[PDB]
Amino acid sequence: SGFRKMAFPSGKVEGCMVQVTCGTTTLNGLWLDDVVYCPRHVICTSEDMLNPNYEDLLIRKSNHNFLVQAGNVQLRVIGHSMQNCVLKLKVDTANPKTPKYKFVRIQPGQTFSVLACYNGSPSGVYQCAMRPNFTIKGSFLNGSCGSVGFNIDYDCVSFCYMHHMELPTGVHAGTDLEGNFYGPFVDRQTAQAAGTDTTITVNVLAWLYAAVINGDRWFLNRFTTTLNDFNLVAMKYNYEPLTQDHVDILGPLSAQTGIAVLDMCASLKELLQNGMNGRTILGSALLEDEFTPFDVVRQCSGVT
Amino acid sequence: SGFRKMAFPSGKVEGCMVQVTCGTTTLNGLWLDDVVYCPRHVICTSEDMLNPNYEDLLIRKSNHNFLVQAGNVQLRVIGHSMQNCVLKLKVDTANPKTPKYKFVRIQPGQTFSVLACYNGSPSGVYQCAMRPNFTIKGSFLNGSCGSVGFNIDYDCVSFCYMHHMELPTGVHAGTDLEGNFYGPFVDRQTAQAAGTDTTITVNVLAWLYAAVINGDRWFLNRFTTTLNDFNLVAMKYNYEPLTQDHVDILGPLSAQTGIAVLDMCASLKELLQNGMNGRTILGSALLEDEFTPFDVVRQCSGVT
Ligand SMILES: *[C@@H](Cl)C(=O)N(c1ccc(-c2ccccc2)cc1)[C@@H](C(=O)N[C@@H](C)c1ccccc1)c1cccnc1
Numbered sequence: 120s121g122f123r124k125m126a127f128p129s130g131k132v133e134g135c136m137v138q139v140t141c142g143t144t145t146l147n148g149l150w151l152d153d154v155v156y157c158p159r160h161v162i163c164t165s166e167d168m169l170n171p172n173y174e175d176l177l178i179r180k181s182n183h184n185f186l187v188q189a190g191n192v193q194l195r196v197i198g199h200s201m202q203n204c205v206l207k208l209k210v211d212t213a214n215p216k217t218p219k220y221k222f223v224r225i226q227p228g229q230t231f232s233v234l235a236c237y238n239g240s241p242s243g244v245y246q247c248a249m250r251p252n253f254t255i256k257g258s259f260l261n262g263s264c265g266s267v268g269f270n271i272d273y274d275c276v277s278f279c280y281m282h283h284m285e286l287p288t289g290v291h292a293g294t295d296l297e298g299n300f301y302g303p304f305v306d307r308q309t310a311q312a313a314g315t316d317t318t319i320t321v322n323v324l325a326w327l328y329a330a331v332i333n334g335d336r337w338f339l340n341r342f343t344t345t346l347n348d349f350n351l352v353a354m355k356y357n358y359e360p361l362t363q364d365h366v367d368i369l370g371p372l373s374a375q376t377g378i379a380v381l382d383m384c385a386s387l388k389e390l391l392q393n394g395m396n397g398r399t400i401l402g403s404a405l406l407e408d409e410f411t412p413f414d415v416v417r418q419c420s421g422v423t
Numbered sequence: 424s425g426f427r428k429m430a431f432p433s434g435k436v437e438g439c440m441v442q443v444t445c446g447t448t449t450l451n452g453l454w455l456d457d458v459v460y461c462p463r464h465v466i467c468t469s470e471d472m473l474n475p476n477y478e479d480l481l482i483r484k485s486n487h488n489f490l491v492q493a494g495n496v497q498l499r500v501i502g503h504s505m506q507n508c509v510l511k512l513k514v515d516t517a518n519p520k521t522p523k524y525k526f527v528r529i530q531p532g533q534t535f536s537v538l539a540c541y542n543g544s545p546s547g548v549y550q551c552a553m554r555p556n557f558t559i560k561g562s563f564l565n566g567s568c569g570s571v572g573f574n575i576d577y578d579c580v581s582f583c584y585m586h587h588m589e590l591p592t593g594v595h596a597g598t599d600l601e602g603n604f605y606g607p608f609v610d611r612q613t614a615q616a617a618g619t620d621t622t623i624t625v626n627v628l629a630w631l632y633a634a635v636i637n638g639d640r641w642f643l644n645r646f647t648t649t650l651n652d653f654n655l656v657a658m659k660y661n662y663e664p665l666t667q668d669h670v671d672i673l674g675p676l677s678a679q680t681g682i683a684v685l686d687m688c689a690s691l692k693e694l695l696q697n698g699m700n701g702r703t704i705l706g707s708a709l710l711e712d713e714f715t716p717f718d719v720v721r722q723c724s725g726v727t
């Protein structure tokens with residue numbers, strides 16, 4: 120019993136964090152095989168934040184301008200390239216602790232674990248969702264850039280996010296491990312705002328199924344609903360539209376609870392139209408949307 | 424910016440988790456140097472849950488009745504003893520991945536990280552508080568027993584919790600690493616209640632300081648209060664009484680924000696007396712009490 124914001128174990132990712140310094144700037148890199156990945160803004164200075172020409176700036180740099188440090192050991196940069204918004208530093212030593220890994224581009228509403236790092240040293244781990252507007256609501260200070268987001272399938276670490284910057288709201292933006300930013304953001308000091316963020320409907324439904332599995336059954340109602348009718352109520356409360364793919368994805372929890380998806384949807388509508396009257400579901404006074412149906416199945420089936 | 428329930432990196436603890444089997448029962452053990460620690464209930468069977476005489480049960484066991492498995496390696500048990508509610512299995516090989524560690528008995532209201540394990544394999548990591556009533560509100564399934572709670576100071580792992588059981592309300596109970604239970608609980612199937620759990624007042628104040636630091640300031644009011652005055656209101660809402668030591672402990676956040684502690688108390692008082700009016704602080708619709716002043720400082724200063 121119980122339901123917590125649970126991260127994956129971070130050990131495999133800890134062994135891959137290094138410190139990358141270029142001139143004055145210090146930020147975290149990810150060391151896999153004989154390559155270190157980090158944010159390309161590491162090569163900027165203050166004069167160049169409003170509109171850097173990275174191509175130009177990168178040309179003014181040589182291999183020896185990049186100091187890479189893993190623990191106390193200094194690694195030798197024998198190459199450097201830029202892939203979209205990431206710098207790839209080629210080093211003469213493959214990481215002995217390189218896990219089985221993939222790079223994946225995740226979809227909005229999916230979750231991952233963040234290993235928040237400073238000076239190449241892991242500081243903490245937490246679970247995050249990629250918001251519909253392609254930001255993440257993380258917890259990151261100055262120096263956190265290069266910190267990575269990941270999911271672990273058995274032995275394979277799937278890297279899906281690299282932290283690049285904080286926005287005016289205080290939300291965070293970043294890229295996949297191929298340097299492509301999630302959303303419409305750019306690595307420069309300019310006016311950037313995220314779009315309207317919606318609530319991940321399928322995630323709230325999964326969390327409600329988790330509540331039932333944990334005995335919090337009050338919100339359950341005597342009414343059912345239809346996709347069309349629910350989706351009309353959803354648009355009003357800035358909830359993402361629910362698809363049959365979402366209905367199909369929730370099947371495992373429906374079968375374990377004996378509660379059909381559309382009956383769960385009808386209970387959400389009432390919580391949306393009538394509020395929670397001051398009660399709490401799974402310790403929260405608001406509807407949570409950062410848990411996927413998989414996250415819920417995992418935290419209720421005990422996957423290791 | 425941002426504020427999340429953040430766990431410590433779990434890598435150091437991952438390398439210490441093993442699988443302990445005695446007869447039919449499998450659970451998790453902690454392998455440090457040449458000793459494996461696990462819950463003594465591993466030696467029990469179904470007929471013996473209501474009132475086991477462990478001394479007696481243990482006498483029916485020899486070294487070879489204990490299977491310890493770390494990954495695929497089977498370790499050889501060369502000794503066994505019982506310390507309070509933990510079994511200590513002596514093995515012939517010291518753990519090569521043993522971190523610098525201590526065993527600590529933590530105070531109520533303190534926090535720690537849990538590495539939830541099944542079959543000796545890490546599954547997930549999350550942050551918990553030891554409740555005033557000496558339970559924890561965790562997320563553990565069958566097979567979780569022997570999973571541990573810890574804090575990491577630099578390279579030093581302080582083990583403070585081993586999971587032993589789930590109580591009727593589905594909160595969890597366990598021991599320190601000397602096998603002394605937190606609270607009045609015993610390792611048998613009897614009826615055990617936690618009694619009244621209060622809110623950790625000092626942690627709520629810390630969290631409020633976290634909010635201010637993150638720009639959430641609506642709840643700040645034009646009042647101050649006194650310790651006595653505040654505590655009279657705290658007792659009414661089952662908040663732990665605030666001491667001068669708690670006041671001293673909040674000094675960093677106080678100095679950082681330039682908001683005096685007693686002024687923050689007066690703001691808590693109104694929130695308690697008036698509720699939050701359906702507003703939120705740091706993405707929550709209720710007052711959070713599972714972050715310590717240290718957790719807050721750490722998350723708002725960048726410790727690794
Ligand atoms: C831990 Cl691997 C587990 O699956 N248990 C559990 C704990 C303790 C015992 C036990 C105690 C004394 C003698 C023999 C065996 C057995 C199983 C789960 C659990 O605590 N069930 C509770 C209801 C229980 C308490 C006391 C005795 C028996 C059962 C458990 C389940 C979920 C999360 N954590 C632990």
Ligand SMILES: *[C@H](Cl)C(=O)N(c1ccc(-c2ccccc2)cc1)[C@@H](C(=O)N[C@@H](C)c1ccccc1)c1cccnc1
Nearest residue numbers: 160163168259260261262263264283284285306307308
């Ligand atoms: C990352 Cl180590 C960091 O401390 N930054 C940061 C990000 C990006 C840049 C940058 C961008 C383009 C050219 C040069 C440098 C510098 C610093 C923090 C940050 O994002 N500050 C924001 C306001 C910023 C955005 C864009 C440009 C400059 C600054 C930061 C702070 C807190 C959490 N994460 C990141």
